[PDB]
Amino acid sequence: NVNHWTNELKNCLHFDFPVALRKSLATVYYYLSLVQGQKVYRQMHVDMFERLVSLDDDRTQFTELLQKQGLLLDHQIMLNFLCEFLPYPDPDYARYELSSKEDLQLFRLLLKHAHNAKPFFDKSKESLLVDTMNFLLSSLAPSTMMAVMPIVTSVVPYHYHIHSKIIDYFPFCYSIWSSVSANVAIDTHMYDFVGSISKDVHNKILSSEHEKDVVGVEFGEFGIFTDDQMTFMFNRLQGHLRTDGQIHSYSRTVKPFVYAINGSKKDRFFEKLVSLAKAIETFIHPSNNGFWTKPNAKFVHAFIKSYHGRVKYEEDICARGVTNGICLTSFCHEEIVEIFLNIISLGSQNKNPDIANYYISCFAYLLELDPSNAYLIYDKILIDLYDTLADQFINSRHRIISSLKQFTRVIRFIVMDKLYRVHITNVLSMLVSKLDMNDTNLTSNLINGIVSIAAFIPIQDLTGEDDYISFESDTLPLVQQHFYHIKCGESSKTFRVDDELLNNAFKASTTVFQSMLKVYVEKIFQLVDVDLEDSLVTKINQTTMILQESMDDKIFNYFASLLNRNFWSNDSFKEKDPNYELVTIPLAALVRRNNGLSKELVRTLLFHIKEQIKRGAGSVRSTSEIQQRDVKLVLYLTALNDVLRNCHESLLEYSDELITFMKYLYDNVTNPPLDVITSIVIHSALATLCTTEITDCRLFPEDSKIPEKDRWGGLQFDPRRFDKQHLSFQWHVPSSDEITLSISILESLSEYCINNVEELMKAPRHDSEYGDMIQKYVLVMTHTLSGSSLLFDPDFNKY
């Protein structure tokens, strides 16, 4: 059977194999996809091909290596299929009609497949280009418009010869285009073409083989485009954003404009881009919503993805010696920010939050270009944020939530520039304390900030005991001076500070971590009793577990005696139905990092659970609901589940005390909604012994695995971020000792259940505190089978 193997192959790409065998494999799937006459799972075969020819399989490009390794595919077969979609005379036979999904959906696939195997059409059959156009062209008429155009864009290879180049065919596209008014049914193909072709010429000019038979395609002012060709596409794009809104996926529509820039002859183009931003200016304004606010947003983003796209492909090539003056200069990155900054700032305040998240996400792309301008952006974003935390926006909801998104989509970069980074302690201990219990939304957007600051920063005291220290005296004074400066019109370039004082401010800023976690934990226990739900309960546990991993032993060992402390003495689990998750799990994540903490935490959950049982908890029967007199017993039981699950080998010490307590928990305590809980104890303990998992996630290892203490932005940009001595992960591997307790248990609980149940087969049909007990033992048995699941072998029955 074909379809099966075609999959086990998919599974095999996960390791490696010879390019000489790809030549083979690809050839199979190129011709396989194009079968006719039977039921075929095409989507699969065109996807094999597309993955075999991947142009970025981990920085490696397999279309290059397959071109170089002698792959050549028949174009007549592909074009011959895509042409069954033309008007075959005698209606009685025409098989394919667009319009009707089932058909258009095949066509869209063939077209995709061809795009994939365009580069393997014989560069050497000189009259393959000209032959194929002279055919499609004669086929073009109003009734074919729809099927011909797309074909050309995905079945004709970008060739370039001495006499007949592909750009030879441009003057004909700007004959159709420029004859109908803006029409997405047409335009989308024109942009896709002159763009994936302009991308091509650029790609080919750099590094590789600057040829393909002709470097006889000159770049200049406006990419490969005439003066009037460029001029036209500009006023057409303006037409789209101001008048006729005719564009889809914009990534494609933007190409031509990006790949027509010439680093050494921009000017005349930037002149054309500026007047396009000055036109578009008013239509972004937060109170001018219309049919356009989508196109302008989806474009201003598609364009700055597709520019940064190019830059990071060239900077990958000037890591190969080849500058090329076609390349984008430090001064392009500058004039790009000049243009789209008011534009991006207006859009991000827009009334639709989705249409804003587009303009707001552009800040990250611009900052990666590390332009000289960088300050202009950090300047806005930080005022907008400091104003918001000072309640200067309290009358306007959007500015508050907006400028917190601006700031989040940009945190990681602030941790770098050695000036801004100072603010980050303050801005964090401010977010934590401003976490609202009534505004579900503000809180979700604050956790966003809090977790982003923790993901790229080590919670560490970086003071060498330097006496001047303190947060005030040394950090606050500076932070206020920077802000005063920034507020009064001045920028950060004009801001002069001593490299001495500014490093006092930074180091002294890393002191507040302790006094601020006492305030985060306090805000967690307040949130245990809120009808926040789901999405946001989780995201909050990410923030508590990320904050832990970015913590040195000094601080963590504090955080631990602070969860421990607050978990016991708290007045915070009242309200009906609580989010235990928000507090039990952050405990488990302490035990992951420090198994030593388990020996005593567990023995305390047990002499506190036996306590609650003995005083009437789960005495009162009910399906459907957890009785509120139980809520405490249920906290301690969830904790015990969540915290065993992460105990691992440290559980070997108090093995016998556990088993004998589990048997106690099932002798006493019957109650169908508590038994779905108590029966999980057995699983969270079998899984923890034999499940093979990670254990260490710390931002920086051991407390000492010194890269030094210029170690902020989490190495996220350093190339040492991934040499093997940094990434020294711990891992729990099940030892012969654990597997052996693992099995002791399995048989001891497995018996316990089967006895207590083979007993109850002296049947009381009434009781109903009988069907409660049989369900109990069948749940304990069940969760005994899971977690303990890693010791079983599918194949055992063959042997």
Binding site: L32, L140, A141, S179, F729
Partner: protein
């Protein structure tokens, strides 16, 4: 063996594990657990049938015991104490940047890889004797009667067929037997449940592959089509209907470039005899399957022919033999089927009849396609499109372009036909062109196929087409409708007729047609004209002596019908035909039909009678000429025959809508060569291309005439009034020309209309000081069209002459049609912005500004200023700008004049009205400069001493300060501070209406 490897502890399939005490220990325990769950199941179904809570907890204990083997899949994804890989990826990954991750992320990423290496391990296996026992139990539960039980069991039996091999077989051979039972044990809710099972994604899918068992099953679901009592039978129909839509079979030799398997061809010598052996078994596995369906086919026709009357699920059969006696990839055309499918016309039921046709027409178009493919079933999926009657033509042929043109006008000695949509040509010639042969053959088929078609024409009596069309009319009264499915059936009767099998003679369809033409019944006329369209799709059928009996009947019939006496009900139908027919058949297959609508005894010329009648043609001739657009269009006549002078609108408008179409037919540029073509596009003035569609000189001449014939008649209204206007010839022409322009500016004809604007179309239109009130009468909106022509497909060089037409030095000519050209500009600018050379961008701005000053019309000084802002918005460069500001604020600045004077001036002086209107527009062109430019305060200050004067300029200076104070509203908390000038006060009056004091 093993390629997944996940630290299985007991060694990765070394059977380092089999020699491990700890490993027989472990499975000996899962065995006990398994044998114990069965011990409990039997103990419950015996002691506790009426309990749901128990059985749910057991059914989860089995969803686990069967799945949680290598992995952990229930509990798999509960938020636990690990940071989520998907979350962290969002926080840290920038795109176009390789893994910029912090240490924390790398660590989950790795753990995430281990955990996925575990789930990779295919747990799929062979049923373990005990495992078969428990799967049988899980069925008696998914076969239970309580929804609170059977619904989790079904969901639980699906997680179990994912895990066992050919377990679907175990399931069916338990279902069917215990459904056949639950039927002879009566109305059971166990039938209701078994049907719920059969609708499970995973089962309902494997059903269309069980050729053995679907025999017995369809006959069980049929017996089930009796709501003896429940929702059953509703479910049995949905299911039997779902079934007709699956199944089939593929004989056809995968049209594969043999290069789809070669590259992977092992050295192994003929140890690839195996391949040619598989080829043979997957070829009689197939041929057995194919026979099982024919056995089912015939065993149903049994229960349909022999079962005196079963009622209206008479329908499954027909809905099915059809997707079967016409599938191919085999399928031996049975003649006993074609008989039974037709003898179901005797139930005189609308739905059955609609289907007998839909079926008879496919069951033939299949037998037909065997002859055309010569039994080479493969030849369908080979794009060397066989059919013996298709012919390819070389188009590069030095000479071809004029074969076409002079062969499309040929109706008597026709050489080729393009039924359908004619693509090749139009743009250029050179391609090969698929075409069809004249007096198309019938072709031969073997005897089995022959006696089948005989058994149709021997059944298509004068009486049977009587019964069947009648019905199609009555079911049709509700809807209207046309469906080609109807016409493509009549062409079929025609093939059958004079090819031998029917013998009904065409003179029988001429009555059947003339018959259904009651000038009254709409759904009855629709049947008549559905018939006509068939007689024209029945030239793919011999007899040149019948193709003359039919050309003769048709000129006779179109006479009775269209030659006077025509309701908006007929017109509704025939006009439907005109847009359709020419697209499903080349109309030259008929000498009379087309050469009838073009016989134009219909366009009178003046009104002191009743002129006459209607578009009792025009709109139907047009909708044929629209659908050909290329072919047949020799119309030397029509152009010399058009009117324009016509008194009525319904005609004036229609003569225009027709000319529009007549022009789009001579505008296709179809060139000689692709090469000859691209050399024209290359050498064009605009770095762009050729005007696509270009009106050919001999027509550019016609049109120019109609405009300059109307300029000749400007004496015709030397001084008449609106009432003696609608009656002049000058109006009639003018109205027609207008309706024409309206229809050019719409759609694909725009590129045709442009050359005429500058000299013809815009001088016209502004036929409006040629009377405003004359437009209100014969309701024409010129203003809305002239200006709506500001946007549109203009080309680099055409812009030139258009900006020169506006901004005319002859401007001064018009009067408040001035605020018109000024609004056309405001629109052009928005659609030619970024495309205008700073030269043009100026010729405009110097016109606009020359209007802030034109003595006389106060109306326009204001419309000019409102427009000058549209300019100064895209004008950020600061020296064009700051040099205007100065030009304007020189006519006012300071107290050039003392108080008493400002009052006097503000009311009369135009040079100062302009200066304040202008300087006003500039400020209103920067609506939201987020931090405010200091040239704005200082220049509102110069404007405030003037908005303090009541008069005409001091008024449009209050506009400018209120307009402003308004849009600055939300940014005002802040803008206040850039107004040191206690000329904040100076801005308080400003807005005054009558309601303020």
């Amino acid at each position: 063996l093993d390629i997944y490897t996940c630290n299985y502890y007991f060694g990765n399939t070394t059977e380092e594990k089999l020699q491990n005490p700890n490993y027989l220990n472990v499975h000996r325990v899962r065995a006990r657990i398994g044998h114990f769950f069965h011990k409990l199941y039997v103990f419950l179904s015996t002691n506790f049938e009426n309990n749901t809570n128990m059985f749910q907890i057991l059914l989860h204990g089995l969803k686990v015991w069967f799945t949680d083997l290598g992995q952990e899949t229930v509990f798999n994804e509960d938020p636990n104490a690990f940071i989520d890989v998907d979350f962290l990826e969002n926080v840290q990954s920038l795109s176009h940047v390789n893994e910029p991750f912090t240490r924390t992320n790398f660590a989950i990423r790795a753990n995430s890889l281990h955990q996925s290496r575990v789930l990779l391990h295919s747990t799929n296996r062979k049923a373990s004797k005990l495992e078969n026992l428990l799967l049988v139990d899980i069925i008696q539960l998914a076969t239970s009667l309580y929804p609170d039980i059977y619904k989790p069991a079904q969901g639980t039996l699906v997680h179990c067929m994912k895990q066992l091999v050919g377990s679907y077989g175990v399931v069916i051979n338990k279902i069917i037997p215990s459904l056949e039972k639950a039927i002879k044990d009566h109305d059971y809710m166990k039938i209701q449940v078994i049907l719920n099972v059969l609708l499970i994604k995973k089962i309902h899918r494997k059903l269309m592959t069980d050729y053995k068992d679907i025999g017995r099953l369809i006959f069980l679901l049929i017996e089930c089509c009796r709501v003896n009592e429940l929702e059953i039978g509703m479910y049995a129909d949905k299911i039997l209907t779902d079934i007709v839509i699956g199944i089939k079979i593929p004989s056809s030799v995968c049209v594969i470039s043999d290069q789809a398997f070669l590259p992977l061809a092992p050295p192994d010598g003929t140890i690839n005899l195996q391949v040619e052996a598989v080829k043979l078994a997957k070829k009689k596995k197939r041929e057995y399957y194919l026979s099982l369906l024919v056995d089912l086919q015939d065993k149903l026709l049994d229960k349909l022919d022999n079962e005196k009357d079963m009622g209206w699920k008479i329908r499954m059969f027909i809905l099915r033999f059809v997707t079967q006696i016409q599938s191919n990839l085999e399928s031996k055309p049975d003649k006993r089927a074609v008989f039974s499918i037709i003898s179901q016309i005797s139930t005189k039921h609308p739905e059955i009849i609609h289907l007998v046709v839909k079926s008879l027409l496919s069951t033939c178009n299949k037998i037909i396609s065997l002859s055309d493919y010569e039994y080479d079933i493969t030849r369908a999926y080979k794009n060397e499109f066989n059919p013996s009657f298709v012919e390819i033509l070389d188009t590069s042929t030095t000479s071809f372009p004029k074969t076409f043109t002079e062969e499309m006008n040929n109706f008597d000695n026709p050489k080729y036909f393009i039924d359908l949509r004619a693509y090749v040509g139009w743009l250029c010639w050179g391609r090969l062109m698929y075409v069809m042969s004249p007096k198309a053959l019938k072709l031969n088929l073997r005897e089995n196929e022959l006696e089948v078609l005989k058994t149709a024409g021997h059944l298509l009596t004068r009486e049977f087409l009587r019964d069947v069309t009648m019905n199609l009319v009555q079911d049709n009264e509700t809807r209207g409708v046309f469906s080609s499915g109807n016409v493509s059936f009549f062409s079929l009767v025609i093939l059958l007729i004079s090819s031998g099998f029917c013998e009904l003679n065409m003179s029988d369809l001429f009555e059947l047609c003339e018959s259904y033409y009651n000038k009254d019944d709409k759904a009855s006329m629709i049947m008549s004209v559905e018939i006509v369209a068939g007689l024209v799709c029945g030239s793919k059928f011999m007899s040149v002596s019948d193709l003359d009996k039919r050309d003769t009947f048709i000129e006779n019939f179109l006479a009775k019908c269209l030659d006077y006496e025509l309701n908006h009900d007929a017109f509704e139908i025939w006009s439907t035909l005109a847009w359709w027919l020419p697209a499903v058949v080349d109309l030259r297959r008929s000498k009379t039909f087309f050469c009838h609508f073009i016989n134009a005894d219909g366009m009178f010329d003046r009104e002191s009678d009743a002129a006459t009648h209607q578009t009792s043609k025009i709109y139907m001739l047009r909708s044929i000429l629209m659908s050909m657009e290329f072919r047949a269009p020799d119309v030397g006549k029509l152009f010399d025959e058009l009117v324009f002078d016509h008194p009525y609108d319904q005609v004036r408008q229609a003569v225009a809508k027709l000319l529009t179409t007549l022009v789009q037919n001579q505008s296709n540029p179809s060139i000689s060569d692709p090469t000859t073509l691209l050399e024209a596009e290359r050498n064009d003035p605009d770095g762009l291309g050729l005007p696509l569609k270009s009106v050919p000189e001999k027509v550019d001449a016609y049109i120019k005439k109609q405009f300059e014939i109307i300029k000749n008649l400007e004496d015709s209204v030397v001084g008449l009034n609106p009432q003696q206007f609608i009656k002049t010839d000058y109006f009639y022409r003018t109205s027609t020309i207008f309706y024409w322009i309206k229809e050019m500016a719409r759609g694909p004809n725009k590129v045709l209309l442009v050359p005429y604007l500058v000299d013809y179309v815009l001088p016209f239109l502004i036929g409006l000081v040629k009377h405003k009130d004359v437009c209100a009468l014969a309701s024409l909106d010129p203003v809305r069209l002239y200006a709506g022509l500001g946007y549109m497909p203009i080309r680099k060089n055409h812009v030139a002459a258009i900006v020169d037409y506006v901004c005319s030095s002859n401007v001064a000519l018009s009067s408040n049609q001035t605020k018109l050209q000024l609004a056309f500009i405001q629109h052009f600018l928005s659609a030619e912005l970024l495309q205008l050379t700073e030269e043009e961008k100026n010729k405009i701005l110097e016109f606009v500004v020359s209007n802030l000053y034109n003595e006389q019309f106060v109306e326009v000084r204001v419309r000019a200023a409102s427009i000058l802002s549209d300019i100064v918005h895209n004008w950020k460069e600061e020296q064009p700008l700051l040099s205007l500001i100065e030009r304007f604020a020189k006519g006012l600045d300071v107290n050039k004049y003392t108080s008493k004077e400002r009052q006097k001036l503000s009311k009369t002086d135009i040079k100062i009205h302009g200066n304040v209107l202008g300087l006003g527009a500039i400020i209103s062109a920067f609506p939201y400069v987020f931090p405010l430019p200091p040239w704005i305060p200082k220049n509102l200050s110069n404007l405030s001493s003037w908005a303090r004067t009541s008069g005409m300029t001091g008024n449009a200076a209050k506009n400018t300060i209120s307009e402003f104070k308004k849009v600055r509203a939300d940014t005002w908390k802040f803008d206040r501070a850039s107004f040191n000038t206690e000329e904040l006060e100076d801005l308080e009056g400003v807005l005054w209406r009558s309601y303020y004091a």
